Ligand binder design. Structure first.
Ligand SMILES: Cc1cc2nc3c(=O)[nH]c(=O)nc-3n(C[C@H](O)[C@H](O)[C@H](O)COP(=O)(O)O)c2cc1C
Ligand SMILES: Cc1cc2nc3c(=O)[nH]c(=O)nc-3n(C[C@H](O)[C@H](O)[C@H](O)COP(=O)(O)O)c2cc1C
Lengths: 202, 200
């Protein structure tokens, strides 16, 4: 139950504007990419990126998440086929799950498990893990990499093949890597502030 | 349905190591602050922060979120009261002190002009991610925040006058930190406790 003074670099309202403005333009350049280069990336980059995600706030500091980093070609092949076969039942074509150097499979912990077997339930897990995934993608973009935020599909396969315990569930599938040379993204337009931001003034 | 070549910077692995490490340590310095300063912040600062959050990915590009920014000391004080009464069942000065409350709402669905309801996809995680970008933007701006439960939901829904398709997702005061701002001496999990790596 110790305490420490907050060590945070703050800036005058002037420097806060350029910071917030420049950062918005930087993040606005981020786009979901679905065509990856199989170019190699040092694991330490991914480790830092995952670690950067783990710095996110969490309900009661539980940090109820497990980041399963996957570079093994055989596992990625298994996961791909499972994803294609599940989406095939209703593109379903998903070569990016094998071609991307790393699959970051995010799991959410509904509860922690202690040595004595008892279960200490976590709080606001969906929110906490979601925020961490936000930090993940923000870090991926900071590294100069691209990603494909993807549904954790199929959940049961991902659960087994990664051998994660029953307290955990797949939250998000995130292939990561360089973009392909001929990579293209859809000409999408993001909502303007009038459509997303309501303001109650004095 | 047009298409654009991806326009993004590429670094060598080493320049990636640097930036990935440089960004981790910067983000490690972020802490939940519960003691705020009443120092006024330009509305435009938080406008950028909210739009930064809005650049987040979303299921089917629906962007199912509404960021309700509250500076009105009167509504901030009413939100404070109801929050305390709710948490009383078993204390929140920051909800008034912080110059802004960013109440994030999630949209279960969109309502078309013809009154039809077009359902959204993976709203919880989409908005959660967006809230991640929000806190990243806040930290980038040298500001601090208190990620907080959206309680009570019915009250926040009513007083902020949001439609049925929306529900409170998170409440976050935003502002400068207090002078003698103390944070709990917490220690984050290490690589071993949160990261499982499958090599070849
Ligand atoms: C929770 C979530 C799940 C997603 N699942 C998929 C998916 O299964 N397949 C896919 O191609 N894209 C998926 N996406 C990516 C979105 O379609 C994409 O972010 C959206 O089209 C907007 O594009 P942008 O992120 O580049 O701005 C997902 C995004 C989110 C946030
Ligand atoms: C989804 C979510 C809900 C939270 N709700 C509260 C809350 O209701 N009250 C509070 O004091 N802190 C709340 N927090 C903040 C956490 O308690 C805090 O982030 C945690 O103690 C770890 O501290 P850190 O974020 O500085 O690393 C919440 C955080 C998250 C992610």
């Amino acid at each position: 139950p110790a305490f420490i003074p907050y060590a945070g670099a703050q800036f005058e309202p002037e420097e806060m504007l350029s910071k917030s403005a420049e950062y918005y333009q930087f993040m606005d350049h981020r786009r979901t990419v679905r065509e990856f280069s199989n170019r190699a990336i040092p694991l330490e980059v991914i480790e830092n990126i995952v670690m950067t995600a783990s710095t996110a706030p969490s309900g009661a500091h539980k940090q109820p998440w497990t980041f399963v980093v996957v570079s093994d070609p055989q596992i990625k092949a298994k996961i791909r086929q499972a994803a294609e076969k599940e989406e095939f039942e209703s593109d379903w074509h998903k070569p990016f799950l094998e071609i991307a150097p790393y699959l970051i499979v995010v799991f959410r912990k509904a509860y922690d498990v202690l040595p004595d077997g008892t279960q200490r339930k976590n709080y606001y897990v969906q929110e906490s893990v979601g925020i961490a995934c936000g930090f993940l993608l923000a870090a991926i973009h900071q590294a100069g990499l691209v990603a494909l935020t993807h549904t954790p599909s199929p959940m049961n396969f991902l659960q087994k093949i990664l051998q994660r315990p029953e307290n955990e569930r797949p939250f998000l599938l995130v292939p990561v890597g360089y973009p392909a040379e001929g990579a293209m993204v859809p000409d999408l337009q993001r909502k303007d502030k009038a459509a997303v931001m309501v303001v109650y003034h004095h």
